[PDB]
């Protein structure tokens, strides 16, 4: 309703860097809010793509941001009569970024790994890795739960069980309030997908440079399955956290599996032991139901609700014709130990190929009326197809079907405006929460400020 579309602030990264692919707000120990931006195709210092991360201090005028340094050198370790190898070329550092407390977690989902032993190998595969930084001290740590030292032949002899070689850990990420990092790894277990959880504190305290394979004792990974419904499901393509069992002592996980059950798609709500509490099935095959997931209480009753995006959903039209527009499903959490029912609301895109529901961002309370709000991206929407972000205000009934406001892309065709979104943080300290929108195709980020 009240985001100002005229006085925008633009931050920009290097050409071809994909600056804006991922982003988050970061609050320092002094409480000052900055913006963390991922740029997964940024050139490293040897002109090879490695990705990178930028930390933008808030300024009305915007501009260029300093690059948050990480080690981009490959590592080799000869130990235990084996040779361990990390490969950082084309790793996509900054494909996801998340901030918690005074820590930034930036992941490189396509970082590769191999282990050699005589004439045998593990296979050179994208295990992924996350880089953790504490800017105000300079501390650095890493976490790569899918690296192993098992040779190829052993997976063959064991029918490829617990095969974590293609995890792409950090493909998605979220951090609980208590400081547990939860990473989505959709390639896990031969493309079923998996989740990896560890406390940030324990990641830092157990990491030393050059070790490459080390133990985080508090870590917890999800499980392999022989259920073919899960095969190639990409469970962990998206991830979120929330409160869904009425017990505030436990944290629940929300996991998107957009190709689950022969591309029907699904989203699951799980406890922190990874026991399924509920499953929400997709409506239409190949719609990518579970591409995005968001958690926020929208109807003011204090119980978290769930929003799921299916950006390739095809809507029925005259004479048995279908139009790919995208869809968003709202599930309101009921009272007591009851399941989530059918959707309370379906929001559907209007522009062909617009990919509405590609990103969904909780905005907090944008208009300060007592109900939380959301923003939904359609990165190729609007009449020109340049991209659009749509604001929906919460109410007693849940959400309004009509957006309170539409933000049209200020960037040219191809920018993917809205592909990433974050709100619910007041960057300029005016008392209203603001919205940051990434346009990785234009290597830029737009900041919209909420007004009285």
């Amino acid at each position, epitope marked *: 309703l009240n985001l100002d579309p005229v006085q925008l602030t633009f931050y920009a990264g290097p050409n071809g860097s994909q600056f804006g692919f991922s982003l988050d707000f970061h609050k320092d120990s002094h409480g000052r809010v900055a913006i963390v931006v991922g740029a997964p195709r940024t050139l490293g210092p040897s002109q090879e793509e490695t990705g990178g991360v930028f930390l933008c201090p808030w300024r009305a005028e915007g501009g260029q941001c300093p690059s948050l340094l990480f080690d981009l050198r490959d590592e080799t*370790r000869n130990v235990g009569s084996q040779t361990l190898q990390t490969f950082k070329a084309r790793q996509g550092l900054g494909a996801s970024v998340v901030s918690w407390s005074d820590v930034i977690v930036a992941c490189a989902p396509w970082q590769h790994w191999n282990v050699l032993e005589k004439t045998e190998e593990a296979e050179k595969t994208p295990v992924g890795s996350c880089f953790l930084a504490q800017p105000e001290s300079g501390r650095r740590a890493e976490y790569s739960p899918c690296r192993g030292n098992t040779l190829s032949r052993i997976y063959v002899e064991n029918d490829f069980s617990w095969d974590k070689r293609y995890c792409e850990a950090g493909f998605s990420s979220v951090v609980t309030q208590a400081g547990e990092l939860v990473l989505g790894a959709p390639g896990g277990y031969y493309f079923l997908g998996l989740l990896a959880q560890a406390p940030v504190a324990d990641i830092f305290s157990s990491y*030393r440079p050059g*070790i490459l394979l080390w133990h985080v*004792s508090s870590q917890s990974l999800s499980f392999d399955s022989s259920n073919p419904e899960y095969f190639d499901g990409y469970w962990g393509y998206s991830v979120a956290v929330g409160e869904f069992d009425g017990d505030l002592n436990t944290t629940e996980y929300v996991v998107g599996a957009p190709t689950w059950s022969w591309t029907l798609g699904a989203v699951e709500i799980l406890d922190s032991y990874y026991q399924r509490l509920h499953r929400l099935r997709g409506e239409q095959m190949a719609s990518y139901f579970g591409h995005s997931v968001a958690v926020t209480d929208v109807n003011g009753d204090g119980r978290h609700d769930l929003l799921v995006g299916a950006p390739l959903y095809m809507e029925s039209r005259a004479d048995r014709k279908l139009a790919e527009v995208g869809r968003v499903y709202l599930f309101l959490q009921p009272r007591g130990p009851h399941a989530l029912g059918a959707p309370s609301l379906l929001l559907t895109g209007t522009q062909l190929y617009g990919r509405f529901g590609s990103a969904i961002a909780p905005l907090g309370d944008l208009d300060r009326d007592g109900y939380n709000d959301i923003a939904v991206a359609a990165p190729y929407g609007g009449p020109s197809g340049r991209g659009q972000v749509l604001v929906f205000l919460g109410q007693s009934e849940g959400l309004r079907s009509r957006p309170s406001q539409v933000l049209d892309s200020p960037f040219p065709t191809g920018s993917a405006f809205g592909f990433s979104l974050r709100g619910a943080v007041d960057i300029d300290d005016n008392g209203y929460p603001d919205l940051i929108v990434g346009a990785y195709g234009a290597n830029q980020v737009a900041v919209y400020r909420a007004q009285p």
Partner: antibody, heavy 119, light 108 residues
């Protein structure tokens, strides 16, 4: 607190077998590699082998291949070392060992189990 | 197998001394070395892993150094509790192999 709790002192006859045990306390035995090491006064410290209790895979020093068998049971959170064809050279103190962080390190040790081979 | 040669086999030293124990490997082991302590009549405690990293809880007076085939454990300002046996172990290769040890003795 990580602690490796080994079984008691053994007095055993030559030609016989003995099975030592190492129970994990304050962690799960499958968390890391578990190693077995032998100590004698004169000959010093010798690595016998290791197990990955998650899957049962073992490595041995060739000097102990055929004498030593390492096993583990995740149900009881215990690792075992069995020594067959006991000789006077097997009179020693035996330790189980696991790393702290580094997969390949040797950081945490049990209290030791004394084995005396005698007629 | 990799031979670990540790020196000296003993030393007679005093409280407050700074002392170094060396370990020479028969080939390069690129910092894949641990240092261990055994107090009289006791079991082992790990001091250092991967050349220079202190095991959690170990006092700051212990430090590791070296590269290639040659490493050192240094104890700065000896405590009464430091008169013990010390060993290196390599894990560059299987089989893991140990040094012959160094006993810190009290000078009088």
């Amino acid at each position: 607190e990580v602690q490796l709790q080994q079984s008691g002192a053994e007095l055993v006859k030559p030609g016989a077998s003995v099975k030592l045990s190492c129970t994990a306390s304050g962690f799960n035995i499958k968390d890391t590699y578990v190693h077995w090491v032998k100590q004698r006064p004169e000959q010093g410290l010798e690595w016998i082998g290791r197990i990955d209790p998650a899957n049962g895979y073992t490595k041995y020093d060739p000097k102990f291949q055929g004498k030593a068998t390492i096993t583990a049971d995740t149900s009881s959170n215990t690792a075992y070392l069995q020594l067959s064809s006991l000789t006077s050279e097997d009179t020693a103190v035996y330790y189980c060992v696991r790393p702290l962080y580094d997969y390949y390190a040797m950081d945490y040790w049990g209290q030791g189990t004394s084995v005396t081979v005698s007629s | 197998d990799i031979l670990m040669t540790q020196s000296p086999s003993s030393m007679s030293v005093s409280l407050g001394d700074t002392v170094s124990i060396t370990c020479h490997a028969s080939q390069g082991i690129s910092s894949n070395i641990g240092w261990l302590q055994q107090k009289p009549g006791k079991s082992f405690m790990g001091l250092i892993y991967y050349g220079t990293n202190l095991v959690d809880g170990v006092p700051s007076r212990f430090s590791g150094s070296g590269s290639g085939a040659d490493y050192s454990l240094t104890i700065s300002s000896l405590d009464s509790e430091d008169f013990a046996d010390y060993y290196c172990v390599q894990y560059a290769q299987l089989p893991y192999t140990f040094g012959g040890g160094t006993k810190l003795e009290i000078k009088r």
